[PDB]
Amino acid sequence: DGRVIYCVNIIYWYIRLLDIFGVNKYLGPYVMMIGKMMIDMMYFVIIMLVVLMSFGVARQAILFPNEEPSWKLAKNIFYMPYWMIYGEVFADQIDPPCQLPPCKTGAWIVPAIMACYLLVANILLVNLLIAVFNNTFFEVKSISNQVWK
Amino acid sequence: LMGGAYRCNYTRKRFRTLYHNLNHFPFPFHELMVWAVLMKRQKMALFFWQHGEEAMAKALVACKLCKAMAHEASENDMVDDISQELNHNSRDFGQLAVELLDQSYKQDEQLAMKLLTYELKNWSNATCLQLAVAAKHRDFIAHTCSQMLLTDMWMGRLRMRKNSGLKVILGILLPPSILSLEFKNGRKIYEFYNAPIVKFWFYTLAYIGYLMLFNYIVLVKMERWPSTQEWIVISYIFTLGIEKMREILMSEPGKLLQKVKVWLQEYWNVTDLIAILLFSVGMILRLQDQPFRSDGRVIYCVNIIYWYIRLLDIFGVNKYLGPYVMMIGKMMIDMMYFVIIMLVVLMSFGVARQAILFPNEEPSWKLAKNIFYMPYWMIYGEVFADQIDPPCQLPPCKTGAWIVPAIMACYLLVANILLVNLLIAVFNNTFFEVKSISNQVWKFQRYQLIMTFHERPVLPPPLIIFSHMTMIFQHVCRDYGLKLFITDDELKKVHDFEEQCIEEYFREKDD
Numbered sequence: 001d002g003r004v005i006y007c008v009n010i011i012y013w014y015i016r017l018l019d020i021f022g023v024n025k026y027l028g029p030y031v032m033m034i035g036k037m038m039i040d041m042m043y044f045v046i047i048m049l050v051v052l053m054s055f056g057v058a059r060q061a062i063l064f065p066n067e068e069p070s071w072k073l074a075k076n077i078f079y080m081p082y083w084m085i086y087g088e089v090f091a092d093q094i095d096p097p098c099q100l101p102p103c104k105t106g107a108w109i110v111p112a113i114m115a116c117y118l119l120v121a122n123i124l125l126v127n128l129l130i131a132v133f134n135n136t137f138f139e140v141k142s143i144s145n146q147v148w149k
Numbered sequence: 150l151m152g153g154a155y156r157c158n159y160t161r162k163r164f165r166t167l168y169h170n171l172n173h174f175p176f177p178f179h180e181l182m183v184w185a186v187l188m189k190r191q192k193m194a195l196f197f198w199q200h201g202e203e204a205m206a207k208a209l210v211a212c213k214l215c216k217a218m219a220h221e222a223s224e225n226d227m228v229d230d231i232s233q234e235l236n237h238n239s240r241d242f243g244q245l246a247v248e249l250l251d252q253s254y255k256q257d258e259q260l261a262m263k264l265l266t267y268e269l270k271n272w273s274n275a276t277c278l279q280l281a282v283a284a285k286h287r288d289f290i291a292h293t294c295s296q297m298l299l300t301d302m303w304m305g306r307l308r309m310r311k312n313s314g315l316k317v318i319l320g321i322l323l324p325p326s327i328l329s330l331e332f333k334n335g336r337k338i339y340e341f342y343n344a345p346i347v348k349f350w351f352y353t354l355a356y357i358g359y360l361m362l363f364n365y366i367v368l369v370k371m372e373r374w375p376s377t378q379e380w381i382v383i384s385y386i387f388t389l390g391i392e393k394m395r396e397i398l399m400s401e402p403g404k405l406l407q408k409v410k411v412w413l414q415e416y417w418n419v420t421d422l423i424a425i426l427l428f429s430v431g432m433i434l435r436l437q438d439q440p441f442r443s444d445g446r447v448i449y450c451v452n453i454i455y456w457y458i459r460l461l462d463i464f465g466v467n468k469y470l471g472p473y474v475m476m477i478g479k480m481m482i483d484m485m486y487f488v489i490i491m492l493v494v495l496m497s498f499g500v501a502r503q504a505i506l507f508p509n510e511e512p513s514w515k516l517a518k519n520i521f522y523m524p525y526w527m528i529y530g531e532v533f534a535d536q537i538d539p540p541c542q543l544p545p546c547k548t549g550a551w552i553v554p555a556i557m558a559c560y561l562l563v564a565n566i567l568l569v570n571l572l573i574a575v576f577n578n579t580f581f582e583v584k585s586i587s588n589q590v591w592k593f594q595r596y597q598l599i600m601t602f603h604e605r606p607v608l609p610p611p612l613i614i615f616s617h618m619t620m621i622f623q624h625v626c627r628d629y630g631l632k633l634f635i636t637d638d639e640l641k642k643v644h645d646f647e648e649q650c651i652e653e654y655f656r657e658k659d660d
């Protein structure tokens with residue numbers, strides 16, 4: 001357990017190098033820009049979290065209808081729908097090819113919900129976030145320069 | 150022309166009895182300005198506007214009348230210059246009203262707030278805010294003074310303004326903590342539990358609890374008879390349905406087919422009705438044998454999708470999330486325009502690949518699946534080298550199998566480098582106007598939020614059945630927030646302040 005605490009504590013001392021980088025004339029302003037875009041990214045990540053939870057609950061309820069109540073249920077809701085939007089989309093881990101295994105009732109809805117979810121989470125929200133970063137950048141740049149100086 | 154709830158002074162029985170056997174007018178300039186604005190004489194109306202009293206009410210009524218007359222002229226296929234003239238008049242009167250409000254707020258804030266909410270006895274008892282809302286004057290409601298008034302109305306009779314929310318949550322979760330809260334100058338509980346913000350937080354906590362219960366009965370196994378949580382969810386939806394029915398039957402018009410068509414104007418109500426009906430169908434199909442039980446489970450899952458999505462309506466109360474929701478609403482239209490082109494290209498590539506690779510397929514419904522499945526999952530990072538263009542001991546090679554990777558290269562280049570980047574450009578270069586319009590619309594709809602929360606009963610929908618049965622008892626038998634009745638001395642002071650304000654405005658503009 002102490003080794004684990006060490007391995008988690010090393011991350012902060014790695015991140016603290018940005019405070020050392022702040023002495024530069026071109027890196028400090030970018031660090032402060034990151035600081036403000038973190039707030040913007042949180043505000044635009046709450047909505048994505050809502051949509052992700054919805055799709056995960058739908059898939060987990062449709063595919064597995066005979067699950068005993070266990071803490072592992074809270075893992076399948078967040079695991080796969082979060083790894084899915086980062087390029088790890090699979091065709092067998094979701095909507096399995098139901099000699100052949102029996103077919104769960106309503107298994108044909110999961111790919112359609114997945115298509116809608118991918119369209120609304122990889123084409124709409126991230127592009128809107130890019131627009132928000134782009135159209136609120138000059139003021140942040142000027143304020144960051146003033147604050148660093 | 151004015152609207153539904155309006156009742157002009159001429160049609161009242163007092164004036165009808167006066168006119169049956171035949172005096173003067175108390176305020177003549179009201180009648181003269183109504184005449185000048187009905188006969189499409191603009192300069193005379195502007196001259197009559199600055200005389201008399203209740204100038205802001207006259208400006209708002211003129212704006213609404215001009216807009217309604219423009220709509221009527223456009224509907225009756227007139228010369229189509231009359232519509233432009235009437236719209237110009239409406240915009241001029243709206244601008245005058247906004248300027249007068251700005252001057253009044255910049256002179257004295259308290260009298261400016263008192264001016265916007267006193268009952269107007271000459272205009273069928275409507276405050277200035279209601280007249281502005283009926284005219285859809287977005288700039289008037291979105292002003293600083295109106296927003297401050299709406300905030301003071303929404304906060305209720307409390308006095309917490311440095312940091313709210315957490316205090317209200319702690320009060321509603323710990324009832325012995327309510328008393329240690331300052332108020333505005335036994336009876337300190339009825340005032341706390343009737344502030345609109347407290348009703349909103351009660352409703353939000355009830356909704357979160359309902360969603361927590363809904364996410365438990367679909368993940369775990371289901372049984373022949375519903376468990377306790379399923380009964381709680383069903384009771385919640387039933388009470389929500391009867392609350393919607395009560396809301397419909399307590400509308401403004403008097404016709405059943407007219408109240409319904411004005412209640413079906415916000416898409417949230419329509420979607421709520423659809424979801425309630427679908428859940429009712431699912432629950433009816435649920436209390437059956439195994440296949441219908443499975444179908445009811447599926448309907449429960451889809452309804453859970455909808456109720457999860459409906460949390461953005463709760464999120465809209467924030468000062469920074471509502472505008473982003475509306476921006477999403479408009480970028481959805483833009484994305485819908487581009488998805489048609491993307492789908493055309495996708496269908497083309499899918500048909501070409503499916504026809505090239507498999508030349509001995511019997512006609513089956515599975516053909517419509519291979520066209521859309523793989524070419525759609527391909528542009529989301531799942532590009533494979535063996536699932537498409539297989540390595541044809543070695544299997545035989547289909548004729549023309551070497552075209553599929555080339556068509557795929559062209560399709561990926563045109564669907565991941567061109568169309569999505571053009572969509573990013575479209576989002577980026579049409580963002581400032583959408584942002585400004587979204588801010589204006591949210592600041593305008595804060596009033597509707599405040600009113601619809603002031604109208605609602607105290608109890609949340611899970612236990613609203615007690616407040617509905619008290620409606621029956623009180624049937625067989627607006628002090629503030631909507632209007633503010635005042636005496637004659639206060640009325641005279643308000644009139645004098647308004648005259649001083651309008652005179653100063655005209656003098657400053659001329660200077």
Ligand SMILES: CCCCCCCC(=O)OC[C@H](COP(=O)(O)O[C@@H]1[C@H](O)[C@H](O)[C@@H](OP(=O)(O)O)[C@H](OP(=O)(O)O)[C@H]1O)OC(=O)CCCCCCC
Nearest residue numbers: 013014015016017018019020021022023024025026027028
């Ligand atoms: C992992 C790294 C962790 C430590 C990173 C530590 C963080 C870090 O990167 O510090 C950079 C440090 C700062 O030095 P500093 O900014 O004070 O020096 C400026 C720099 O020399 C500019 O080139 C000068 O002209 P200009 O501005 O171009 O016009 C400028 O003159 P002026 O314009 O003001 O008149 C100088 O002031 O030195 C370096 O720049 C590179 C040599 C580093 C060599 C050492 C590399 C290790």
Ligand SMILES: CCCCCCCC(=O)OC[C@H](COP(=O)(O)O[C@@H]1[C@H](O)[C@H](O)[C@@H](OP(=O)(O)O)[C@H](OP(=O)(O)O)[C@H]1O)OC(=O)CCCCCCC
Nearest residue numbers: 300310311312313314315318353357463464465466467468
């Ligand atoms: C899953 C979540 C579903 C429910 C989400 C429910 C949706 C939701 O998020 O509501 C937020 C709610 C709204 O409160 P509200 O906006 O009315 O309160 C404003 C807020 O306190 C600002 O910080 C104030 O200053 P500023 O604007 O910064 O200058 C502002 O004063 P002013 O500027 O007007 O004079 C206040 O009006 O409270 C919170 O803000 C966070 C505490 C929430 C604590 C409770 C968290 C549960």
Ligand SMILES: COCC(CCO[C@H]1CC[C@@]2(C)C(=CC[C@H]3[C@@H]4C[C@@H]5O[C@]6(CC[C@@H](C)CO6)[C@@H](C)[C@@H]5[C@@]4(C)CC[C@@H]32)C1)COC
Nearest residue numbers: 053069070071072073074077360361362363364365368369
């Ligand atoms: C390993 O075996 C575990 C066993 C104890 C099992 O108890 C069960 C009690 C219900 C509980 C805690 C369990 C699994 C799903 C859990 C759901 C996940 C949901 O997530 C949330 C996620 C986020 C919310 C927005 C929606 O709901 C919950 C309302 C929901 C939630 C926490 C309700 C609670 C459920 C475990 C050990 O005992 C010996």
Ligand code: NA
Nearest residue numbers: 086087529530
């Ligand atoms: Na990718």
